[PDB]
Design a protein around this ligand. Structure first.
Ligand SMILES: *[C@@H]1O[C@H](CO)[C@@H](O)[C@H](O)[C@H]1NC(C)=O
Lengths: 111, 126, 48, 96
């Protein structure tokens, strides 16, 4: 039921740029649907970072920047720190299932 | 600030009903503006949306688990109730009560989950 | 002495030295250091 | 640092000055043993009206929080228009 495709894992040096991507099928999630991004520390509740593909809530650092084009969506991280390692999730709305869906979850590792 | 407290039996024998309930503090479940929902995440897998429910009784619900999941809401005791039947070994997961899907202005495609519970690790064993 | 940053290029050709050679010899850089001061005069030292 | 500047029977190795003819300009060292003048006497010694410029920082392992031998290292940078000489440890990644 993973209509959104995510990279199983990714890694990078601290203070560097990493990009996390999320895309879905064509007859499923379309151009109008927007993609939100969730962070999950181990053993904790998922935390929101970016919604609306370009907006962040209060308290979310400006370092996390995302964008959505067509169907594919992606994040950009600047100034990677040891606190950024977590379980990241992409999620959006599937018009064919009439219900929300979640990405497979990507592993961000600090090197 | 809005807090969620959900509880339930963390161990359930195979093949009968499983039941949890979330509590809302510093707020009201009667709040018409937002929806309320349940999200489960099996260990070593991704998040999965099991259904969302409005205060009146209208229910969002994933077709894949149509025949097993029943969700009920009450506004008097501010309790969000979730039931799951015919639980098998594939249903081992940690369940979360979530608040999302604003009704007044956002549409059903731009809805994002906003408030998350602490989670309850629930397993089925013989 | 462009923008500080003293640069020294050198190559020691082996051509005898009986006269000024006409052959082509390039110059490989040796050091490039941020001296940061202006230079206009230039002398040379001797030995003993 | 209570493990290097403190010991049994005390330690009065450190000194500090509380009496000066004026204030100290920033980034200035004022190493001198001149008896501070009181009144108008040109006296040069110890006792009444004649105070030594510097006193001690007698440190012991048993004091209060505010009397502990704090180790202070301050770093001053020159962030002006000049060729760079000292810079941070720029990070590195793998090749791939
Ligand atoms: C209706 O939607 C528009 C755009 O989605 C928004 O600007 C406006 O505030 C909404 N009005 C109400 C009453 O929800």
């Amino acid at each position: 039921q993973s209509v959104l495709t995510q990279p199983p894992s990714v890694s990078g040096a601290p203070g560097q740029r990493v990009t996390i991507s999320c895309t879905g099928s064509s007859p499923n999630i379309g151009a109008r649907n927007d993609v939100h991004w969730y962070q999950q520390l181990p053993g904790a509740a998922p935390k929101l970072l970016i919604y609306g593909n370009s907006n962040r809530p209060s308290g979310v650092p400006d370092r996390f920047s995302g964008s959505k084009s067509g169907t594919s969506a992606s994040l950009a991280i600047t100034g990677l720190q040891a606190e950024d390692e977590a379980e990241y999730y992409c999620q959006s709305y599937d018009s064919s299932l009439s219900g929300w869906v979640f990405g497979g979850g990507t592993k961000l590792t600090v090197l | 600030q809005l807090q969620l407290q959900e509880s339930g039996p963390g161990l359930v024998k195979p093949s009968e009903t499983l039941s949890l309930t979330c509590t809302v503090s510093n707020g009201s479940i009667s709040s018409s503006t937002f929806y309320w929902g349940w999200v489960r995440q099996p260990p070593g897998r991704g998040l999965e949306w099991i259904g969302s429910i409005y205060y009146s009784g209208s229910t969002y619900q994933n077709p894949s688990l149509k025949s097993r999941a029943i969700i009920s809401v009450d506004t008097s005791k501010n309790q969000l109730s979730l039931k799951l039947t015919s639980v098998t070994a594939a249903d081992t997961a940690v369940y979360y009560c979530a608040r999302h899907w604003d009704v007044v202005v956002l549409a059903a495609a731009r809805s994002w989950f906003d408030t998350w519970g602490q989670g309850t690790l629930v397993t089925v064993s013989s | 002495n462009i923008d500080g940053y003293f640069k020294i290029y050198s190559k020691h050709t082996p051509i005898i030295g009986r006269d000024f050679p006409q052959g082509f010899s390039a110059l490989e850089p040796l050091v490039d250091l941020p001296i940061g001061i202006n230079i206009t005069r230039f002398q040379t030292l001797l030995a003993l | 640092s209570n493990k290097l500047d403190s010991k049994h029977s005390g330690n009065y190795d450190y000194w500090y000055r509380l009496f000066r003819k004026s204030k100290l300009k920033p980034f200035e060292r004022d190493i001198s043993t001149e008896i501070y003048q009181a009144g108008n006497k040109p006296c040069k010694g110890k006792g009444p009206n004649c105070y030594f410029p510097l006193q001690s920082y007698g440190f012991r392992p048993t004091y209060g929080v505010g009397h502990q031998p704090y180790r202070v290292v301050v770093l001053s940078f020159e962030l002006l228009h000049a060729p760079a000489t000292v810079c941070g440890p720029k990070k590195s990644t793998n090749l791939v």
